[PDB]
Structures are given as C-alpha cells and as structure tokens.
Write a protein that binds this ligand. Structure first.
Ligand SMILES: O=C(Nc1ccc(NC(=O)c2ccccn2)cc1)c1ccc(O)c([N+](=O)[O-])c1
Ligand SMILES: O=C(Nc1ccc(NC(=O)c2ccccn2)cc1)c1ccc(O)c([N+](=O)[O-])c1
Ligand SMILES: O=C(Nc1ccc(NC(=O)c2ccccn2)cc1)c1ccc(O)c([N+](=O)[O-])c1
Ligand SMILES: [Mg+2]
Ligand SMILES: [Mg+2]
Lengths: 450, 450, 450
C-alpha cells in the first residue's frame, strides 16, 4: 500500500518573536520542518504535501530544493481546513499520514508502527501517556477501539484521570480523508475546523480507530517558543550522543557534544568535551578530537589527533596527521598523511604534502606544498595589490625559514632552502639556497632608557 | 507608605574557607549582597541598612559606591540583635523589610507580594513549602493567621508533617520593629536573640501575622559554602537564559550560557554554546555569536557575526562587521560597519574604518585606520624603546603588505601602497608606493642535509 | 589482620566495540582497572591478584608498572573460576577482597566498612538498595544474617519486592575462599561457576554472612558499554568537583569542570567554566583560571591569572604572572614571578625571567630569557636548516623589537636593544644597539587599482 504525507507548516510562530515563520527555526542545524520532510521521505512517501502560509517567501527560499508539493493556505481556519487544502491530491488507495512542522522529533520507527496498525477504511491515531495530562484531549477506548477524544473542559472527574492523550498524528486512506474532511464543522468556541473531529466522524461511519502509543513524549512535543525549541534540541542532542556511544564512539561528555548533520565513524574514536560536528563528517579509526574543536564538512583519516581549539571546514586530513591546538583549516585545505599543523596556523585552499610541517604563526593560502617540507614560524603566502589570489607552488623537501613572505605567483622547486626573514618574489630553482643579505647598524654603549 | 530595608551581611562564612567575608562571594559576577542591595533599591527602599562585621575593610572597599547605611556590628548575638542595630534609624510610619546578604535570589516580585499582604501594625512573614521540611521552623496557622513558628526539636508528630516553613524574611512597620526587638530574649540553647521571636511577640500584642508563600524555594536559599553558591549560580543562570529564550534570543544550550551583567538585544539573535556575556552588552538584530566567545562591555551592531573563540572587551562593532574565529578585541577597539577581523588578530585602542580588513596574525594598537584598507597578514604596529605608546595613523584606501612593521609615531596618507616585509618609520604621502629593496645571496646546487 | 585483593579484569567488553579489552577504557584519564588497583592499594593490600585474559598484551603494556600479580585466565568459566585462579596465592590468615575491573568507583571508605563487618570464618557481602531491583539477586536476611541471594527468575512475589540486592563485592579469609571455591558447581542455565554460590556454601558450613550496604549505587555499577562508562565519568566528575567546592575552590560550574589526575590548591582559587585539569596540578592562593583553559602537569604560583583559552603543559608559572588569553605553554616552559605571556604566544622549553613580557604573536623555543625583557610582537627564535634545536640566550633588560628573528645558536647580552624587523645571527654585546638598515624604493603618484 502506497503512502503520502501532509505536513502542517503555515504557522507564524508569534512567540518566537522572529521575522522567520515558525517551522524554519532549526534543530541540530536544520529547520524543524526539514526534519519532518526527511522523516516522511525515510517512510517512503510518494508525495509530501506542504501546507504553508506565513513567511511564504522565506519558506520558498529556505526549502527551494525539497521534493514537496507547495500548498499555499490563505486563511487559518483550523487543522482540518489545512489538511483539506492537500486533499484533492490524495490517492483514494494510498495511506495519508498527517504530521506537524513544529513537532520535529517524530520518528520513522513510531510512524511505521502507526501505519501498520491502521485498520482498513479506518484510522490509526498516535497517542501518548502523560503523568499530568491536564489540557490535552483524553483517549476514550471502548471495545479496544477509540470512540472519543474528550477535551479538558468536557471531561468528567473519572475522564480527567485518563493519562492517554491525543497527539494530532494520524493515518487514514485518501478516500476516507476526502470524505470525512468535507464533513468537519466549526461549531466550537474557536470557530475552527479541527482534524480531531475525524475520530467522531469515523465512529459515525462504523470505522474503527485504533490507538498507537508513541515511545517518547518528546516525539510529539511541538515548539511554540525558543525555550521549548531549546528543550527539543537538548533531547535530540542527548539521543544522538547516546546512539554514538552505543556504537562505540567515546564521547567524554554526551551533555557537551553537538552533532548538526551526519557523522560516519570508525572504531576507537575519542571525542573530548565541547566539540561541534557540522554538515557531513567522516572520522576513521582511532581519531582523537581534543576539547573545543569545530569540524564542519571534513574527512579525517585513521589515527589523526586534533588538539584543542581547532576549527576545520571543507577540509581533508590524511592518516596519522597531527592538527592543533589552535589550528584553522579553511575550505579546500587538503592535508596528506603524516603532516603537522600547529598553533596559530591558518591553511586555506592549499594542498600540503606527506610529512610536511607548518607548526607556528603562519598563513598558507592558495598554495601547493610538496612532501617533507618545513614551513617555518611566521611564514606568510601573500599577493601583490590588485592581484586575483595567485598561487604559491612549493616542491618537495623545501625548507622555508621563519618569517619569510612568499609573494604569489611564485614557484619554489624541489630541495630549495630559504633563509629566515626573506621576501620571495622570483621563482626558486631546484636545490637553490636563497638567503637575505642584511645591512645592520651596530651602536656600542647604547644605554637603554630604564 | 514608605519602605526601608535591613540586610544582614556580618557573617564570616567560615565554610567558604576564604579570606573574603561571606556575602562578597559572587553570583553572576556580582557579590551576593549586591544582588540583595539592588533588589531593595528596585523595591523603592528609601534607606538600606547594611549590617556588617567580619571582613569590614573588604566590605567597605568592594561596596564603596553602594547607597547604604553602614551599621557595624561588633558582636554576633543573633539576628534580632543584628536588626536592632539599625532600629534607631527606622521611621515609625515606614515599612521595614528584613533580607539576608547570603540569600541573594530573593525577587522584587516576591517582596512586593509580601509588603502588600502586611496587615496594619502586624507582620507579613515569607514562608515556603518543602517536600522534606526537616530542621526548619514549621508554620502554625490558626484562623488564617500565623500563631507560631515551631522548631524541629519541639514539634509534635503531626507538626513535623507541616511542609510550610519559615524563611526569616519579614515585613513590619518601624515602630512595631523598635517595640518588639526591645522585648526579644536569648533564653534558648544558643543563647541568641532570634528575629523569629517577633511572631510570638506580635501574637502577645494581638497583632496579626500573615504568611506569604515564596514562588521558588531558591529565592530563600542561603549559601553557606561554595557548593551551595554554585547551585544558586546555576539556578540564576538557568532563569536568565529562560527569560532570554522567551524574549526570542536563540540560545542553543541554556545550560551552556552565562550572563554576568546586563544584555540588551534585538530580534533573531543567535548565541551558540559556551558563550559568556559580562558587564553591559548590547546586541542589535540578527547578531550571531559562535561557540566559545567572551563579550564584556561591548556594543554590537545589527547583522554582525562573531565566529568561534573571540574575546571582546570595551569595544564597539558596527553593522555587518565580521569578527573571528580567534579574534581579540581589547579595550577601545572601535570597528566601523562592514569591517573584517580574522584569526590570531589583536586590536587594541584603535579605530578601524568602514570596509577595512585585518584578517590574519596581526597586532594593531593605538591606531586610527581609515575606510577600505587592506591590512596584510603579519602586520604589526610598534614603538621605539622608551616610547610612550605613540599612534599609527593610516588613511583611507591604504594597502599594507604582509609582515610590515609600522613604527609609531607615523602617518600613512590616503591611497598609499606598502609592499610586503617593509619597516615603516617615516610618514607615507598620498598615493605613495613604498616597497623594500632586498639584497639576496643565491647559491646554486645547495644540497640540503637530508 | 592482613589484606589482599583479587580484581576481575579478563573481560573482552564486546559492547565497547573496541580493540582494547574492557577494563582499559578510562575514567578521568586513567583505566577503569587502575582506579580499582589504586583503591586496593589505598586499603593496604599486601597483594593484588589481577585476573586478566582478553587483550592480554595490551593489559601488560598499559599496566606494566602496576604492583600486581598477573593471573592469566585461559577460559572464562564464571567468576568463582576466575577468583580460584588466584586462590593458590591466598594466605590462610589474611582477608581477601573481591573487586571488579569494570566497576571502578568502589571507594576505600565503603571497603573499610565491609572488611570491619566481616565475622571470623565468615563473609561480608556488599549490598545496595535499588528502587527498581528487577534482574538483581535479592538479599534474604534471617536472624540478621544473609541466608540466600535469590535470583530474579526464582524469587516469589514477596521476594521480588526486596530492594536490597547483591553487588558481587565480598570479603572472607584466604582459607575459607580456598575451601569454598573448590565446592562451587556449574549446574545452572549458564553452566558457570558463580562466586555468588559462596553465600550458600558459607551457610552450609554454619558460617555467618553479614550484609554491608554501599553508600552510593554508582560505587557498584559496572560499565558494559561507552554510554554506561560516560554515566560513571559524569558521576565521578561531579563528586570530584563537589569535594573541591567544599574545600573552598570556586568552581563556577561543577558540571563544566574536569579533573583527570590530582589537584593541589591554595585558598581563594577561582576556576571558570570548561576548564580541564590533567596529571598533577598545583595551584597556589588566589589563582584565577579563565574559561576554556587546559592545565596538564603544571605548578602555578600564588596570584597568577590565566586568561581564557590557554593550554599549559609540563610548565612552571611564578607568582603574580599573567598568562593568556590564547597562550600556549609547551613542556619545559618556566615563567618566573611577575612575567606576562599574551595572545597567540607559544613558549617551549624556555625559561623567562622576572618581569619579562612576551605579549603577542611570538614563538620562543629552547631559550633562556633574563629579567625585565621586552619581547616584541612577531618575534621568533629559529634555527638553521639541519640544526639540532640550538639555544637562544637573552640576558637581562633586553629590548627585542617587533618581528625580529633570533637565529640560534645566539647570545644577546644584558641591556642590549634590537630594532624592529632585524635578523639576529651574531652574538649581541652588553648595551649594544642593533638596528636594521633598510633600503626602500619610493614611487610618487602611484594610483592603486581601485
Ligand atoms: O497543530 C500544530 N502542531 C502541533 C500539533 C500537536 C502537537 N502535539 C503536542 O505538542 C503534544 C500532544 C500530546 C502530548 C504532548 N504534546 C504539537 C504541535 C500545527 C498546526 C498548524 C500549523 O501551521 C503548524 N505549524 O507547524 O506551523 C502546527
Ligand atoms: O540568617 C542569615 N541568612 C539566612 C537566613 C535564612 C535563610 N533561609 C534558608 O536558607 C531557607 C529557609 C527556608 C527554606 C529554605 N531555605 C538563608 C540565609 C544570616 C544571618 C546573619 C548574617 O550576618 C548573614 N550574612 O549574610 O552574613 C546571614
Ligand atoms: O562481574 C563482573 N563485573 C561486575 C560485577 C558486578 C557489578 N555490579 C553491578 O553492576 C551492580 C550490582 C548491584 C547493583 C547495581 N549494579 C558490576 C560489574 C566481571 C566479571 C569478570 C570480568 O572479567 C570482569 N571485567 O572487569 O572484565 C567483570
Ligand atoms: Mg612576522
Ligand atoms: Mg618579518
């Protein structure tokens, strides 16, 4: 049986006090609605009907590449009215799952269990037990089936003690949705067409409604403000960290670890406190990440150690390389195996060959450095004024003395030696030794003003 | 009706194992007693009577500027004796609130509710419910009024089950305080004059004592050691973070956020984990603060992004500026709109004009830099030996080549160009190009010792 | 009465998904088994019998220096079989305590209370109360003595409600262990010889088994995976931080503090959030450590302030020194009293004399710097190519101008002055002023390409 999803995402999110619409606020670096779209995709949804409204232009720019059907809602008249906007696109013989852009932690596993329980021509309603169910619609089960969702204000004393409550998440076939949505009324205090009413309509038609309990409450929780969003964030981070720990990643403190994307890892990986992993990150075996590192879109080979307070982005690090502390790898930094990058070093769009070292107070930009080079402290690759970021090409086995400026476009051939304090503007030949001729004034008996 | 406060702050705080007296230990960067003084001020207190004793000289140096009446207590004979020291200064027709220098989280809101409930010629006693009230004085209410505070050792089985306990915080008029304090005795195991006894004395005089429950237990908790102080700190930090989140500040992790002063913010502000905000900080709209930043006494314009591990102090940052990662702004750094400050860059008491860039391994101190300047990597402003920190004045549209030393006092005029590796000691004229003439020795066939 | 310990440490730890055996995973920087060995040593154990098996070679390399008896177990046939491997080495008249390499938080205090309760020719069994005891062996006490350890699958309804459970930790004399271990059978579902059976065997012999409740559950908890290991880590860190706070160390956030070794401290020490203390660290009075610092094997004198994001290792810091922010002290850095080390500064195997300053973008390696020296921004000590890390010797009261390279081996005598941008290769005499003679090309009317 086929499946399609409807995601409610039209909300303004007034209590976020933001220029963004509600569902664009992020959880682990990606919009709340994107988590829901990805879950619906993971489920095998043929179509994903996205109900949107407030901040329409921002929704379109931030989610331009999502394979969704854009259903523009002009008036907020309740959740049944929102779902009915997508109803002309429902296949009669497909299942439809209703999800909420502001409740991002719903899992594929929970939803699979919900779809599976759906009786033919009936509804599968996602429910949850609360220690304090006050304010939520109570689940009334008679003969194993859901006969009513009794709201707080209507419940009798005995019903107020029911801990099982309605989440809003439900599954039914497209024909049943089309049929029942056309029958929902707005005769209530809010004057809204509630999707909740489908339970009563299904019962009127002698169709069964089966309840399916969610594993965690946090899967059904919605974020109405940034405090609630921060609580979903911490729950999501704890869950990601716990999964990594059970896979064998040594995360020293799961409460001080953040994953905002995907992590591929080998065995015996050690991650110290306050590390942030962003985008797509791949770590080989025995990678050690020191305190305070930020890795965004990087590939790290086996046996690499990243020392504290290193920031890496869009970079590749070969096996047994040693980075940090206080190293900065900017996009395009490609470090070969057994390389060394030290404190207060910045590498940008440069390749560094096997065994080469760049250990102090250096800027290497738009360069190619060969194997077994020694880049002295204070070395800087630079350009002439008005240039267009030209390249510095350094061969194999080159020594570059401390505080040397390499003025691109320039080539330094294999085995060349450059003395400290040099300004390199002309190409250096193979085995060429280039040393600066200094002129100095020496004044004897110079008594300091102390 | 007028109000004045009495704050007990004479304690040694032996269990802090410190040379400081008890109340000078800080919560969110300010002494515990200062929080209480500020609360009493926010309430509208005409006078704030500060009872002090231990570490008297340190109290005077650390709180020199507080608008308090210094009441030096020579002997610790109990809380009623402490309050009686200030009693000759109470106005008969004013209300007096008794507060504790070591219980800093008491709120203005709680105290307003306490003052309001105070019956004429009576007492308003602040109380709190505890799940485990063991050791605390139980509130005995008869005919809605507080008839007794029954201590742990005296309570009957039924009274030990009372969860409502005495906090020590109370309000009464100045004449009633003067009258009842003169009647407090010390006939008890400790031989102390307890302020607690005022409840029994008020009852003897047929004056009503009304109980007022505190909203949070943490408002009445006192810190006797640094473990307790750390628990008040975390509660205070969580409360500050929660308020900011409800105002619309996106704090990624409220458990990894510290505010030690005041924060003024615009909309869509994003604060990553492990950020510290000190003194008075103002952030405009859409300010993004990366992980590990420290902002102390700074003004940050709209649309500024501060990248990870940046430390800013007594600085101003114009709109759309980009700072970090690993940037250091020291006092007097003034960055104009659309400026760029990069990694391993230190700016001290310098103004940097619109669109100017200082992106790598640079020290700029006591300087004025104009608009659209390019400050190369490794550039350093310096002085002669025995100098008195002279100024470097750089005009508009100046290019300063990498690893150039600018020797103050020096002026570089508009549109000047400075080549890499230069030593600037003489003023550079408008559109003047200054390039270093290098002498180099080139030795061919130099085989490295590898 | 003498004591010896047996520690079970043969486990593979399959669920760690690691190449290391189970007990080598660390808690606070040291292997789980090492914590247990140290506890057994603190107790006064004459012998420590270490049962090992999986990852035998790694156990031997990682614990080479431990004063233990290496008992190589070839087959895992249950805990009684493991303890019996060490039994030929038990003295009849000594007490034997059985401990587990994967339950590292067991305290000396708990074990002292266990040994003390041991009745002659009997057993002292360590027990613990659990709110949910499901799955654990229930303690059956009859006439004050332990008559049985009833397993989950055998317990009657009434016995399942017993909250007191078996921990596996026990004490008995060597003769009793030898005797009872020879009588343990493997007739059970697992076909293993359980140490648990010693309780039933002691009862058969009319020897009393006394229960001793552990203070904390976490002392008896074992780590089977890295999630469980992380929970023991956080509990251990919280306990260490709480002890330090009660001793008077101001730890701003005990949940963001890590101690991985030993800390000796004076009074009025302040430690900001996210600090890591490794190896042996000693702090004097009024030491202030800013956010994000890492101190490994360092001695810090009184009144030192370490500013944020400083990494120190195998270094000594004299009184009133000022370090950071962003300073790096590498092994052998020895800073005398009243010295100053600033941002983006790296000190390696160098001594820096009293009052000397190294405040910006500098590398000082293999050097001796005297008193009251001024090391300018951008200064670098370096070597010739093929050198063997030679020394830079700087006297007292030397000024070294910004962006100067000091080419070791070189000596700079007392009161010498070095101008900015200099290359020092030759020794500088007492009171010698060395300034660079620059040649520059000046081109007027150079219009920039803007
Ligand atoms: O109803 C919406 N979202 C929604 C619905 C239900 C819940 N459920 C709960 O929070 C919940 C339920 C039961 C127990 C605990 N929490 C959480 C969020 C909704 C409606 C229209 C919208 O447009 C949007 N949106 O995302 O903008 C959300
Ligand atoms: O009594 C003092 N402080 C004080 C008094 C009461 C409390 N209250 C509680 O801790 C409390 C009460 C009820 C329930 C929970 N906590 C906390 C602190 C006091 C007295 C003399 C002093 O000199 C100082 N001081 O600040 O140095 C404090
Ligand atoms: O049994 C072993 N360890 C062990 C034994 C008991 C416990 N106890 C508990 O976890 C416990 C007990 C009671 C209540 C709560 N937790 C924890 C760990 C064991 C046996 C053989 C081994 O070789 C190793 N090891 O360390 O590799 C451990
Ligand atoms: Mg330099
Ligand atoms: Mg230079």
């Amino acid at each position: 049986k086929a499946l399609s999803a409807v995601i409610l995402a039209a909300g303004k999110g007034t209590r976020m006090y933001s220029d963004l619409p509600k569902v664009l606020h992020t959880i682990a670096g990606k919009p709340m609605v994107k988590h829901v779209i990805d879950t619906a995709h993971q489920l095998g949804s043929e179509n994903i009907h996205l109900i949107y409204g407030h901040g329409g232009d921002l929704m379109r720019t931030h989610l331009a590449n999502e394979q969704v059907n854009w259903v523009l809602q002009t008036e907020q008249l309740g959740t049944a009215h929102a779902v009915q906007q997508a109803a002309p696109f429902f296949k009669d013989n497909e299942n439809i799952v209703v999800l909420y852009g502001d409740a991002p932690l719903i899992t594929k596993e929970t939803l699979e269990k919900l779809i599976e329980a759906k009786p033919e021509n009936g509804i599968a309603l996602l429910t949850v037990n609360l220690d304090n169910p006050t304010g939520y619609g109570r689940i009334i089960r008679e003969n194993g089936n859901v006969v009513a969702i009794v709201e707080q204000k209507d419940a009798n004393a005995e019903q107020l003690n029911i801990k099982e409550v309605n989440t809003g998440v439900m599954v039914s076939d497209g024909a049943s949705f089309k049929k029942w949505l056309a029958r929902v009324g707005n005769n209530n205090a809010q004057g809204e067409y509630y999707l909740t009413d489908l339970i009563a309509l299904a019962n009127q038609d002698n169709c069964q409604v089966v309840a399916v309990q969610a594993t965690d409450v946090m899967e059904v929780e919605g974020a109405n403000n940034r405090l609630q969003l921060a609580a979903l964030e911490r729950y999501f981070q704890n869950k990601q960290a716990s999964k990594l720990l059970l896979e064998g990643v040594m995360i020293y403190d799961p409460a001080r670890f953040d994953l905002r994307g995907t992590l591929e890892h080998g065995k015996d990986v050690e991650i110290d406190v306050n590390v942030i992993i962003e985008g797509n990150v791949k770590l080989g075996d025995r990678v050690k990440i020191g305190t305070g590192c930020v890795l965004k879109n990087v590939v790290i080979g086996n046996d690499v150690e990243i020392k504290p307070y290193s920031v890496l982005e869009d970079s590749i690090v070969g096996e047994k390389a040693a980075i940090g502390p206080f190293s900065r790898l900017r996009p395009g930094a490609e470090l070969a195996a057994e390389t060394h990058v030290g404190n207060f070093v910045e590498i940008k769009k440069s390749t560094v060959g096997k065994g080469s070292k760049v250990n102090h107070l250096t800027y290497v930009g738009d360069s190619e450095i060969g194997s077994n080079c020694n880049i002295g402290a204070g070395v800087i690759t630079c350009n002439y004024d008005g240039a267009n970021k030209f390249k510095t090409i350094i061969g194999d086995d080159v020594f570059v003395g401390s505080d040397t400026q390499l003025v691109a476009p320039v080539k330094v051939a294999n085995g060349a030696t450059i003395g400290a304090g040099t300004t390199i503007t002309r190409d250096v030949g193979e085995n060429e030794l280039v040393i600066t001729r200094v002129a100095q004034r020496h004044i004897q008996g110079w008594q300091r003003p102390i």
